[PDB]
Design a protein around this ligand. Structure first.
Ligand SMILES: NC(=O)c1ccc[n+]([C@@H]2O[C@H](COP(=O)([O-])OP(=O)(O)OC[C@H]3O[C@@H](n4cnc5c(N)ncnc54)[C@H](OP(=O)(O)O)[C@@H]3O)[C@@H](O)[C@H]2O)c1
Ligand SMILES: NC(=O)c1ccc[n+]([C@@H]2O[C@H](COP(=O)([O-])OP(=O)(O)OC[C@H]3O[C@@H](n4cnc5c(N)ncnc54)[C@H](OP(=O)(O)O)[C@@H]3O)[C@@H](O)[C@H]2O)c1
Ligand SMILES: NC(=O)c1ccc[n+]([C@@H]2O[C@H](COP(=O)([O-])OP(=O)(O)OC[C@H]3O[C@@H](n4cnc5c(N)ncnc54)[C@H](OP(=O)(O)O)[C@@H]3O)[C@@H](O)[C@H]2O)c1
Ligand SMILES: NC(=O)c1ccc[n+]([C@@H]2O[C@H](COP(=O)([O-])OP(=O)(O)OC[C@H]3O[C@@H](n4cnc5c(N)ncnc54)[C@H](OP(=O)(O)O)[C@@H]3O)[C@@H](O)[C@H]2O)c1
Ligand SMILES: O[C@@H]1[C@@H](O)[C@@H](O)OC[C@H]1O
Ligand SMILES: O[C@@H]1[C@@H](O)[C@@H](O)OC[C@H]1O
Ligand SMILES: O[C@@H]1[C@@H](O)[C@@H](O)OC[C@H]1O
Ligand SMILES: O[C@@H]1[C@@H](O)[C@@H](O)OC[C@H]1O
Ligand SMILES: O[C@@H]1[C@@H](O)[C@@H](O)OC[C@H]1O
Ligand SMILES: O[C@@H]1[C@@H](O)[C@@H](O)OC[C@H]1O
Ligand SMILES: O[C@@H]1[C@@H](O)[C@H](O)OC[C@H]1O
Ligand SMILES: O[C@@H]1[C@@H](O)[C@H](O)OC[C@H]1O
Ligand SMILES: [Zn+2]
Ligand SMILES: [Zn+2]
Ligand SMILES: [Zn+2]
Ligand SMILES: [Zn+2]
Ligand SMILES: [Zn+2]
Ligand SMILES: [Zn+2]
Ligand SMILES: [Zn+2]
Ligand SMILES: [Zn+2]
Lengths: 359, 359, 359, 359
């Protein structure tokens, strides 16, 4: 069977024929892959930065149900949930390995579990999210968007601690969010926060790309060029109710944006920084105490968040049609080995999402 | 009228007769002071570390109602809430200036507002907490305990984000708390967490004092001497679900204890750190993201928290009688000027709470 | 100015020119009406079943902003929130008159407040919901859908009382809802519950209409003909986690469906029952106690719910395109007086929403 | 082994020696019974109103730990949790069989499980609540109080649906509770709500008893003689935010109190009504809809609620010492057969709690 395979911790990737019989099966439902998505985590494993001699790559997939089984009919499009539980802890037992207490969960295409960059796989209906045919084209985004749905859900849950965090009109329209770093993560955070009605500023150390300018315009989002720091933003707009670190950057980014967090505010750490050490002095931390600020680590969406993501992607075809049409940057055929290896190995500037087509 | 006065931002304190006419009045109920408490906040203003020429010091008070007004009867004991609202924001409008959005709140005996170290004052029934005569002796602690009630309440609210944070038996008995630092704040966090049933480890850079040893034994709390760091605690007990910084010390303490935070855990910042800069490297921050960890600034209790504190102090006379009887370190007469000025200016080693008695 | 007017409690309705100076203004923004919606509440006032000589009818409107104000561009479509606060109670003061504690709120086109069946009106920006031009056709439904958004939000909030109400897969997909009474309210409850992923059964004392059959098939909803009661449904499907009374029917409907409520379940009372008395015996009530059942009165959506409604309407254009195009039964011109009076006075069988167009 | 045994559904009760091998064991810890409590449920079984030849009666117990086990020391006092889970559903698996989804749970001394009126039993440490020696005398009340702790917890959780249910001072002190029925349950509800600071009116169809009068005066609670209905209370006091049925009597009591429920209010059904049928008319039900009222079935406390009960009983020894000393009406020796059978068979007027002492 054709599969894209990796050999962690070693760098490298192959697109080749493997023995179908030694690949991981998860249930009774046979699913033929139509699309995969690629993201930074795939790039990391391919570049070695994270009885089986290999692992099937890929955790973003849309496939078609080959034969009707229970609630699933032949021809239905489905997406697998990628993180699966440890089987021992109470969070996993209620279907929420995002909060696994043991750390012994599996992650398709990354850890302990064969991924979905293969011709077909067998899965359990419990781990399958129904993808409407009407969002077949952008539906691949439901996996990355699920992470962001969970993250925003969590931020809103935490802010229930504030006696009144709503605005004079009962909404959250008055609350301002700073999304630091663009790319697929920043863009999806922005789209979702605008959908919820919060004001958004996107920030990056440069002017907007064509895609970001469309998002700015269509979603009525603000943009800040942070090339020379954040003083001018603070001077003009003031402080923010929520700040999202969506950069995989140097942790000194946090030193730049922490002074822009307002009273009762939340700093959501979503990106995985891979450089730097950030100094926090007593003045900064004392201020955090006095003003009820919170810093939260945000990771991993689960089935309910994939479903929310499907509804939002559907909404964006109507609300933000121009931005929705830019979520998918390009599609590469599984049969195009040279182009496939290139995109698996490295991101292109201004890439949102690369899709792999099985044919 | 006899009053203890300060002149911020200037260092210094005086006990003298002042014109009752230039003192702040807050409502129609006349209250004669019986006790005040002293804390580090009083020491700070006295030492200049933070029409009207002066401010009446003091935010911890128990007074007696001199004349029956509405629901308050003559002879009733009351304690005033010390932080009061800005009158503009929605949090203050619902009685919760602990989450004030303007920062224009008042704090009795500290900022904008005359305190309670005076023979008598007038107050509004809405800011008065009823103090049962059966806890007259230890009731002064309800004010500092209120801050801690709010803090624990907030930690538990935030942890509702975790799908299941309860244990196999439906309680929080399996959850472990590290309380860093053991003066009145760390001791009160320990007593309250044990009342809630969580396991507690107190930590200081030394062996316990007598009072602490009484807490250890009576409340079945654990103690760790952190003089040579925390590796041995980590190796023996593992990681903690909650960590409270109850030290007003160098922020590098957080560097020490962050590695001891467990999956889904909460670092509660309560102490007001006065020195240092702590480096947080990418590995630490990445881990925080991967494990859904949270850091929260904890400050200020309000009326419902004062009321909860009364119930808990009452409970401790039965549950923890030895500990409860050590909460009050000493009592100084308002008339004993040399001693009073001494205790206002500086803490004694091992002090928990000093009371000022009006007679 | 042309307006549709009533004189409660008397029966009758007129479409005529009225003096602008007599009509209620609510703010600085001029809005030219383009669409109104008609519902049962309108028919009730028209038929006399519910300093001003008259009241402007109507509480469902979409208008166009006439000038470029702060936040609102000229040509923007907006919808007014219909219930407005009493200005005294804490619920109203946080933008939530749905929970008004005084009952002294106003309801546009019903009580205290001129409605929106007029050429134009002046409003405060705080009461305006933005209606994307991409949902101009079905956007009028955002008002009725808002009541339903609030209702489901409240049901889900209440069900947080159950330690685990989610399913084996972390979703609510395993939860079953019985929606009693089809057409508009029942149809919208069904669409929204299926959007959230819950299983739905619609019930009416007849077979489905053409429109209901579309919704049934496209949303994968079940239908039960309740003409001879509920024994057959109970025997086949069992009991339900949520039951919604979406009928304005005799209260004895509740006696029929209460035996179908499952453990930990919620009976949502949304319809305004019009006759009857229902007996509850001790056996029924003790069983409610034993099984943690809840009965909840559900009324009125506010601004955040209108905004959620807009997102869901947009989603349905892609998720349920056939059903979405059957939401608007027909549009009547404001200038077609004979047909207008007819649709104001009586519902037609199987009607979902009639829209009035201003030209 | 001596044990008190019954044979449901037959009436009758025996205190005799029974074969130890025939009695249910629940774990490895041996617990020697020191006290049991008797309540209405016991009286019902004794009077036959609700593989084994018999069932050991009793679900209210304090026993002594025979050997120093895991976290339990020889001589420690413990109380068993009486309802135990089905082992299948997600609520039972998180330690919360109060919300069991299968109904397959066991109830010590009532259903599927031998009770605790026996010389000793073996238990699992997970089902054991530590009873401080400082509350040995009234600690037996922790089991009935647990049900009430759960109930008030649930009411407060449900009321988070109201945007602001707190008062001008951030507390619930402005909220009024009507407790209908003044037995062990009504008294316990009253004490706990007053502990939480809510205003309470107790109601019964007579003047108070001495015990009740003592509760009334010491807790600053109000009393209403409801012998001639509730019109006079409604006229004098108005309506209530919470109404608790602590009856057991005829369900028509609900018809009488429902008109006294206020906006956004909660009717808590705790008592097990024993007769009658109450009519609810369309006017009553539509007003429930209009005012966001809720009716909730309240049943069963679990381990966290036992632990909260321990803290509150301890608090009452200081807060309400006179009331606390009236909670135990009398103690009967296990060897006093004539008196024992008397108290098992029938309640005495004004009784709160009868305790059985194993001598
Ligand atoms: N927590 C979770 O569950 C989770 C899930 C998925 C992904 N992630 C992490 O999320 C992070 C972002 O993902 P992604 O796929 O969007 O990454 P990406 O494609 O690498 O995009 C990173 C964005 O950050 C911008 N950036 C870099 N330095 C910046 C700075 N100093 N200030 C502002 N912006 C800066 C980059 O600018 P340029 O456009 O000019 O290059 C780019 O737009 C990564 O660390 C990824 O690992 C976390
Ligand atoms: N956020 C709020 O609402 C709020 C309210 C009240 C107070 N506070 C702040 O809370 C903090 C504690 O108050 P407090 O009155 O208890 O202070 P305190 O009396 O100064 O006690 C501080 C404790 O920390 C110990 N300590 C110092 N350095 C330490 C270290 N490196 N590791 C472990 N322990 C260390 C001290 O040890 P020794 O016993 O050996 O001296 C002492 O036991 C202060 O910063 C205070 O300003 C905050
Ligand atoms: N709580 C709130 O905030 C709120 C807001 C808006 C509306 N409402 C109320 O919600 C209720 C429904 O609104 P609507 O506009 O959908 O009303 P509607 O157009 O009158 O629809 C009523 C539906 O119930 C069906 N029905 C009647 N008796 C039935 C029975 N015994 N069993 C099952 N179905 C039965 C009707 O059947 P047919 O199709 O065969 O006639 C119709 O499908 C009304 O009482 C309305 O006033 C409440
Ligand atoms: N839901 C649960 O988890 C749970 C748990 C435990 C108990 N319960 C139930 O709670 C109920 C109360 O328990 P209990 O032990 O307190 O019962 P109890 O000892 O029988 O007390 C009943 C009280 O109600 C009074 N009463 C009777 N009719 C009344 C009326 N029409 N209006 C006002 N008061 C009236 C009685 O008056 P007199 O004093 O004049 O006789 C007595 O004070 C019982 O039904 C019991 O089964 C439920
Ligand atoms: O923010 C939007 C709001 O302005 C309105 O249009 O409702 C939907 C939201 O997405
Ligand atoms: O019920 C739906 C679910 O099956 C999936 O498609 O996600 C969106 C939900 O509306
Ligand atoms: O109530 C607090 C008081 O205890 C002290 O810490 O000073 C700050 C106040 O918020
Ligand atoms: O918003 C509601 C409206 O839709 C209708 O039901 O009339 C009453 C209002 O509360
Ligand atoms: O209601 C009480 C309140 O008045 C205060 O005294 O604090 C404790 C509460 O129990
Ligand atoms: O931790 C305690 C628990 O073990 C039990 O005794 O109930 C009260 C709690 O304070
Ligand atoms: O689901 C997450 C995935 O989207 C990200 O790419 O890697 C971490 C996972 O938890
Ligand atoms: O715990 C409850 C008990 O107190 C009552 O007596 O019987 C039913 C149980 O659920
Ligand atoms: Zn990915
Ligand atoms: Zn796990
Ligand atoms: Zn203080
Ligand atoms: Zn304020
Ligand atoms: Zn309407
Ligand atoms: Zn109001
Ligand atoms: Zn009992
Ligand atoms: Zn169960």
């Amino acid at each position: 069977m054709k599969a894209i395979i990796v050999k962690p911790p070693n760098a490298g990737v192959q697109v080749k024929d493997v023995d179908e019989k030694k690949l991981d099966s998860y249930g009774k439902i046979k699913i033929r892959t139509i699309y995969n998505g690629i993201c930074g985590a795939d790039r990391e494993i391919v570049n070695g930065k994270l009885g089986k001699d290999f692992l099937v790559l890929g955790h973003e997939a849309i496939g078609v149900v080959e034969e009707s089984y229970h609630g699933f009919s032949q021809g239905d499009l489905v997406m697998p949930v990628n993180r699966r539980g440890c089987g021992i802890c109470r969070n996993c037992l209620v279907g929420r390995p995002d909060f696994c207490e043991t750390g012994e969960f599996g992650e398709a295409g990354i850890h302990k579990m064969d991924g979905f960059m293969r011709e077909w796989w067998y899965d359990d209906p419990k781990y399958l999210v129904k993808i409407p045919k009407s969002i077949e084209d952008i539906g691949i985004l439901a996996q990355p968007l699920a992470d962001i749905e969970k993250s925003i859900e969590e931020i809103l849950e935490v802010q229930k601690r504030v006696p009144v965090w709503t605005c004079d009109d009962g909404t959250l329209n008055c609350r301002k969010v700073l999304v630091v770093g663009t790319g697929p993560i920043g863009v999806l955070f922005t789209l979702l926060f605008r959908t919820y009605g919060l004001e958004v500023w996107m920030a990056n150390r440069r002017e907007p790309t064509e895609v970001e300018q469309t998002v700015i315009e269509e979603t009525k989002t603000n943009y800040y060029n942070s090339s020379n720091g954040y003083d001018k933003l603070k001077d003009s707009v003031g402080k923010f109710d929520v700040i999202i670190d969506a950069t995989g950057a140097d942790v000194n980014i946090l030193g730049n944006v922490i002074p822009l967090l307002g009273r009762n505010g939340v700093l959501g750490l979503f990106g995985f920084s891979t450089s730097g050490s950030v100094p926090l002095d007593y003045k900064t931390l004392q201020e955090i105490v006095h003003t009820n600020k919170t810093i939260i680590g945000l990771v991993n969406g689960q089935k309910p968040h994939f479903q929310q993501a499907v509804v939002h992607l559907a909404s964006w075809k109507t609300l933000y049609p121009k931005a929705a049409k830019m979520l998918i940057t390009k599609t590469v055929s599984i049969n195009d080995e040279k182009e496939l290896l290139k995109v698996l190995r490295e991101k292109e500037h201004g890439e949102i999402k690369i899709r792999i087509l099985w044919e």
